[PDB]
Amino acid sequence: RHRKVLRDNIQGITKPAIRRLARRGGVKRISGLIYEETRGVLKVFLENVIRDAVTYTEHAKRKTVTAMDVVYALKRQGRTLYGFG
Amino acid sequence: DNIQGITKPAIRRLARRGGVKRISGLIYEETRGVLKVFLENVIRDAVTYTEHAKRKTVTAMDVVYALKRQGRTLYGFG
Amino acid sequence: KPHRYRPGTVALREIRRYQKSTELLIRKLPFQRLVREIAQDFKTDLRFQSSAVMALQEACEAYLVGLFEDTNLCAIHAKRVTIMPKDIQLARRIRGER
Amino acid sequence: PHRYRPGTVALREIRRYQKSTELLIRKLPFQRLVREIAQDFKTDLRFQSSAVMALQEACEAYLVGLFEDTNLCAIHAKRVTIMPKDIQLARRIRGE
Amino acid sequence: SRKESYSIYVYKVLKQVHPDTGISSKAMGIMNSFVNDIFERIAGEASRLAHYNKRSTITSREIQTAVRLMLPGEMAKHAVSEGTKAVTKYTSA
Amino acid sequence: RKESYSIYVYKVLKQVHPDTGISSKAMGIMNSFVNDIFERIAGEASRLAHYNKRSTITSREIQTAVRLMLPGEMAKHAVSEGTKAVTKYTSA
Amino acid sequence: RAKAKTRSSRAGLQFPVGRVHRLLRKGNYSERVGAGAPVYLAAVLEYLTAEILEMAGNAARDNKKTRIIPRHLQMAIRNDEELNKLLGRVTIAQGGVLPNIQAVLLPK
Amino acid sequence: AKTRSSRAGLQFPVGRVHRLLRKGNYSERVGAGAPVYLAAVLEYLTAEILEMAGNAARDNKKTRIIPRHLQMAIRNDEELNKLLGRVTIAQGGVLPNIQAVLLPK
DNA sequence: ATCAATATCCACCTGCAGATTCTACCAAAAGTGTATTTGGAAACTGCTCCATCAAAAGGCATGTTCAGCTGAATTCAGCTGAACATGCCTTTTGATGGAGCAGTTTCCAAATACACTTTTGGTAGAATCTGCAGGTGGATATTGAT
DNA sequence: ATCAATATCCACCTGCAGATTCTACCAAAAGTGTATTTGGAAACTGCTCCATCAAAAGGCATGTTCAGCTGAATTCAGCTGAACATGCCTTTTGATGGAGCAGTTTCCAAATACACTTTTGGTAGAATCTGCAGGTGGATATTGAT
Ligand SMILES: [Cl-]
Ligand SMILES: [Cl-]
Ligand SMILES: [Cl-]
Ligand SMILES: [Cl-]
Ligand SMILES: [Mn+2]
Ligand SMILES: [Mn+2]
Ligand SMILES: [Mn+2]
Ligand SMILES: [Mn+2]
Ligand SMILES: [Mn+2]
Ligand SMILES: [Mn+2]
Ligand SMILES: [Mn+2]
Ligand SMILES: [Mn+2]
């Protein structure tokens, strides 16, 4: 068995989810172009974090990304995350 | 009264180097406040380093270490 | 006349609601797929601890919420109540993300 | 008598000071300010001159960067004049 | 397999401070992360302090200076009080 | 006796610009730069070895640290130069 | 031999002095560790933990709850100036945010 | 007698880098290849910055690189500017840059 | 727009002070040769988690309609901030003289490291204990039409 | 000003998933004795700093004049929020099978340890020659009539 190939999943970050995120951030009104911009920003952020996490995984000679790989990658960007040690 | 030694023309030159074309009259006092906070923080840490080394003379390296602790690495004074 | 709230009232209710709670706001399985697609483009046949995907989602949502806070301040600074891409761009520029 | 129009000399000054690198605050006032502030943390301190020079380089670089961000904030609001609220927005976004 | 954590010490301090309060596992995880983070901040600054002054040994003095460098104003004083007290009690015992 | 990277910076300068000099302040800038990058790479290598319960820092930790600390293309070039130097040293 | 006494109890501490000493020894911080350094560090870690638990438990009681959850820790940190400064770049999983609506967005 | 720097074909000092690794409280042990690799990386970065700064100095009709040339070299290169994003260069100015909306008519 | 008047900036120059480069001596650091130890890789397993799929109900995404309120565009006056002349006060530059602090070396008590042995606190997993989610129902505050 | 509609706020309740307590083993901390390192006090030196005085230029403070920018007021097309039908895709719980992570043993390449030799990098003064005042001339840009 194998996963069918993953494609175009940045669109899973839906307009309602982006709206909810903005709401938690105190935003009352959203221009129509915000959603694509947010998707681009999120994709860059997630790419950077995952690249560093996978670098940690490959240095450990592992094939499984761990929570600690992600934590080290986030600290790596000056974003200490609590709760996954 | 030494923060007033930071004169309006000097603050204006600083703003010019930052690309500012037009400056409201309230900027200068605001800048002074900001500058004071900045200096306080840096100097505090620097003196702590000086005090840890049992010295009474603040060195360039004390200032460099204090600036690094605050995420503002300074080149040229090692 | 069927009842209608005025534009902005439900948005404020939603602000209060989501600022009161802490649950993740992106659907979990789509985010999982996004994580695995991106990671697959760096190294093939990777596996993930479930807590690793959850750590990624917590970090991403916290980042985006903070970014939206700064974006909102940028929009209000320009005498608007509507966030626009240039607000996000100014917030990221000042933050040092560019 | 010859007069440049408002903004022409300001732009000339921008070009001039962005071309050069010398410190823009007078040295003696900055020295005095540094020693005054330091006295409030620990008494009877001495300073290496290079320590004061490092402090001044750091302070001026900080202020120049802050003024850049302040300028972007002012332009964002469709103004060309920086105001205290621009500095406040820039420092808030910066995390200060 | 033996995984160590600060959980039992966090819980003792919690019962000390709020005798009738508990803590969820996720909140305990945040607490463990917090303790390890602060440990690394203090220990790393103490290491750098000893290195700058060419000392082979990290002593309570390096720890104290690191605490003063890490903590905001008043918390620093409080922490210094508790650390100094602990060291003097330990030395007399 | 105070050490610095001055003579090595100057040798590399002569390699790259045989007729160019450097002011004292710029040499200070370069010394700060070299020490900064040294600390960045060495600290990340230390953390890498510690995370994986290893006592030794090897060229593998240095390489991974370079991939972590340096931006994209610079990282590739630095890795090329490091591996190149290591193989040359091993054959010598 | 004499009766075994833990360093934590000698120091009057809840946090473990021996474990902190070992972690200092094995963290490649210095060649040598002084006898007082792990005592001091364990005391400081215990004190900071006590402060955060005090404020988080108060927040939990205000919400009429027995058990501290991450939301209460987030409340305790973000409502305290010095704790919020110390943990400025820290993300608390499942903490959310403080209620805050910019005045200009309220209805007129 | 041949130095390890020369065995590696390097100008930067392999022996000094090895000693600084040993003495920096980084790890209990340092392998033989690590100081070679690290010194090579440092030499490469130094060579890039000196290349660009020397170009700036030649364009300014000057024999000697000064901090201003280093600032120009760093800030005009995307990846160097990213690497040194939070670094202040003493007596390094800023890039000439005037926001378009401030230019006359 | 052109055309004159006016101001500023840039490239060049020379003389020469000062900064950098060159040179030679030497204490300290790197290299060498040899001996010895050891961390960690390789091989071998044994479980732990992960990948992927399956089912089913319901929560949520999507597209659509329609209208309110916002962003965008425009105008314009008053008040602020720029530009500039004038005069003076602070900063800069330079010179002198000491006290005081940063370093340095050394020697012994005191402190810390480390092997071996004993003791117990910390942990994993089981057994027990429970608060709070997740329902209901009613009171109350807010919102918007009229 | 009311009054309907709707959301939100509180109080109640119980069962079970999640948290806490219990239990026994053992890895790790503590105790002991010995070996090794170090911190600091006691003098002593020699640079750096600080204090002090003095003149002068150069930058700053001040006042005046006005251009032009900011903030206010206004208007309007259309974008975005609110509400709803529709339908699907996420969520939750579990099964299957194996990939891969983790524990264990064995041994070698690679690391450390140590005595001694060779080389180097730092330093201060001499020798070199770049960069900076302070001038010019020409390029370039600004400003005001027209
Ligand atoms: Cl936009
Ligand atoms: Cl303002
Ligand atoms: Cl100690
Ligand atoms: Cl190696
Ligand atoms: Mn792909
Ligand atoms: Mn072994
Ligand atoms: Mn409007
Ligand atoms: Mn027991
Ligand atoms: Mn409930
Ligand atoms: Mn297998
Ligand atoms: Mn030599
Ligand atoms: Mn000139």
C-alpha distances (whole Å) from C93 to each of C71, C88, H83 are 11, 9, 16
Structural domain boundaries enclosing D38: 1-96
The 10 Å Cβ neighbour count of residue B48 is: 23
CATH code of the domain in which C91 resides = 1.10.20.10
Query: What residue segments make up the domains of chain B, in order of their start?
Result: 1-78
Per-residue flag: H98 CB under 7 A of strand I: no
- The C-alpha angle B46, B52, B56, rounded to 5 degrees, equals 70
The closest ligand to the CA of C43 turns out to be 5
For A21, the closest of C55, C56, C65 (CB atoms) is: C65
* Chain I nucleotides covered by protein, CB below 7 Å: 6-10, 12, 19-21, 28-32, 39-41, 49-53, 60-62, 68-72, 80-85, 90-92, 100-103, 111-113, 118-125, 130-132, 143-146
Chain H interface includes D31 (CB < 8 A)? no
Whole-angstrom distance, CA of residue C92 vs CA of residue C84? 13
Structural domain boundaries enclosing G79: 1-108
- Helices C28-40 and A34-59 pack at an angle, to 10 degrees, of 60
D5: left (phi over 0), alpha (psi -120 to 50) or beta: beta
Whole-angstrom distance, CA of residue H24 vs CA of residue G28? 9
- Touch H-B: 3+ C-beta pairs under 8 A: yes
- Neighbouring subunits of A (3+ Cβ pairs under 8 A): C, E, F, G
Per-residue flag: E7 CB under 7 A of strand I: yes
Per-residue flag: C7 CB under 7 A of strand I: yes
* Pairs across C and G, CB distance < 8 A: 43
Residue of A44, A39, A35 whose CA lies nearest to A9: A39
Name the minimum distance, in Å, from the CA of E16 to any CA of chain B.
33
Q: Do G14 and E42 touch (CB under 8 A)?
A: no
Question: Within window 48-87 on G, which residues have Cβ closer than 7 Å to strand I?
Answer: 60, 65-67
The 10 Å Cβ neighbour count of residue H37 is: 32
Q: Are H53 and H23 in contact (CB under 8 A)?
A: no
- The C-alpha angle F63, F68, F72, rounded to 5 degrees, equals 95
Architecture of domain A1-85: Orthogonal Bundle (1.10)
List Cβ neighbours of B39 (8 Å cut-off, separation of 6 or more): D33, D34, D37, D55, D59
- The C-alpha angle A22, A26, A29, rounded to 5 degrees, equals 65
Resolution in A: 2.4
Name the minimum distance, in Å, from the CA of C49 to any CA of chain D.
33
CATH code of the domain in which H16 resides = 1.10.20.10
- Rounded distance in angstroms from the CA atom of residue A5 to the C1' atom of nucleotide J103: 36
The 10 Å Cβ neighbour count of residue D10 is: 18
Q: Do A59 and F47 touch (CB under 8 A)?
A: no
Chain G interface includes H79 (CB < 8 A)? no
* Residue of chain D whose alpha carbon sits nearest to that of B60: D51
Helices marked H in B1-78 — which ranges? Answer: 8-17, 27-52, 60-69
* Residue of chain B whose alpha carbon sits nearest to that of D9: B21
Whole-angstrom distance, CA of residue F76 vs CA of residue F85? 14
Show the domains of chain F with their CATH numbers.
1-92 (1.10.20.10)
Please report the sign of the dihedral spanned by the C-alpha atoms of residue B26, residue B32, residue B35, residue B36.
negative
Token pair, residue E68, equals 């003063």
**Within 13 Å and on the Cβ side, how many CA atoms surround A34?**
26
Beta strands at A80-82 and C47-48: parallel, antiparallel or unpaired: unpaired
* Residue of chain D whose alpha carbon sits nearest to that of C80: D77
B1-78: what CATH class? mainly alpha
- Rounded distance in angstroms from the CA atom of residue E13 to the C1' atom of nucleotide I117: 33
The closest ligand to the CA of C81 turns out to be 7
Identity of the residue numbered D66: L
Per-residue flag: A29 CB under 7 A of strand I: yes
Q: Is C45 exposed, middle or buried (0-12, 13-18, 19+ CB in 10 A)?
A: exposed
Which residues face D47 on adjacent strands? B58
Total domains in chain G come to 1
List Cβ neighbours of D62 (8 Å cut-off, separation of 6 or more): B38, B72
Please report the sign of the dihedral spanned by the C-alpha atoms of residue A43, residue A45, residue A47, residue A50.
negative
Helices marked H in D23-77 — which ranges? Answer: 27-39, 49-76
- Rounded distance in angstroms from the CA atom of residue A17 to the C1' atom of nucleotide I61: 10
Beta strands at G90-92 and F56-57: parallel, antiparallel or unpaired: unpaired
- Touch D-F: 3+ C-beta pairs under 8 A: no
Mutate to test the interface with H, among G24, G25, G28 (most CBs of H within 10 A): G28
**The residue count for chain G:** 108
Q: Give the technique used to solve this structure.
A: X-ray
* Chain J nucleotides covered by protein, CB below 7 Å: 5-8, 11, 18-21, 27-32, 37-39, 48-50, 59-61, 67-71, 79-84, 89-92, 99-103, 110-112, 118-123, 130-131, 142-144
Total domains in chain C come to 1
- Rounded distance in angstroms from the CA atom of residue E3 to the C1' atom of nucleotide J103: 15
Whole-angstrom distance, CA of residue E54 vs CA of residue E51? 5
Residue corresponding to tokens 């946090």: G15
Residue of D88, C96, F3 whose CA lies nearest to H87: C96
**Within 13 Å and on the Cβ side, how many CA atoms surround H45?**
32
Residue of H47, H93, H87, H48 whose CA lies nearest to H69: H93
Q: Are E56 and G30 in contact (CB under 8 A)?
A: yes
For A12, the closest of C12, C18, C33 (CB atoms) is: C33
CA of B16 to the centre of ligand 2 (A): 19
For F23, the closest of H17, H54, H66 (CB atoms) is: H66
Closest nucleotide to B23: CA versus each C1':
I81
Residue of H24, H21, H3 whose CA lies nearest to H12: H3
For C77, the closest of D69, D73, D94 (CB atoms) is: D73
Chain E interface includes A78 (CB < 8 A)? no
The 10 Å Cβ neighbour count of residue H56 is: 18
Token pair, residue F19, equals 């007729």
List Cβ neighbours of D14 (8 Å cut-off, separation of 6 or more): B16, B17, B19, B20, B21, H98
The closest ligand to the CA of D70 turns out to be 2
- Neighbouring subunits of B (3+ Cβ pairs under 8 A): D, E, F, H
Which SS3 state, helix, strand or coil, does residue E6 take?
Answer: coil
Q: Is C93 exposed, middle or buried (0-12, 13-18, 19+ CB in 10 A)?
A: middle
Chain B interface includes E66 (CB < 8 A)? no
Q: Residue E58 has what DSSP assignment?
A: E
CA of F71 to the centre of ligand 1 (A): 29
Q: Are G46 and E9 in contact (CB under 8 A)?
A: yes
Q: Are B45 and B70 in contact (CB under 8 A)?
A: yes
Whole-angstrom distance, CA of residue G40 vs CA of residue G37? 5
Q: Kind and range of the H or E element at H30?
A: strand H29-30
Chain D residues whose CB is inside 8 A of the H62 CB are: none
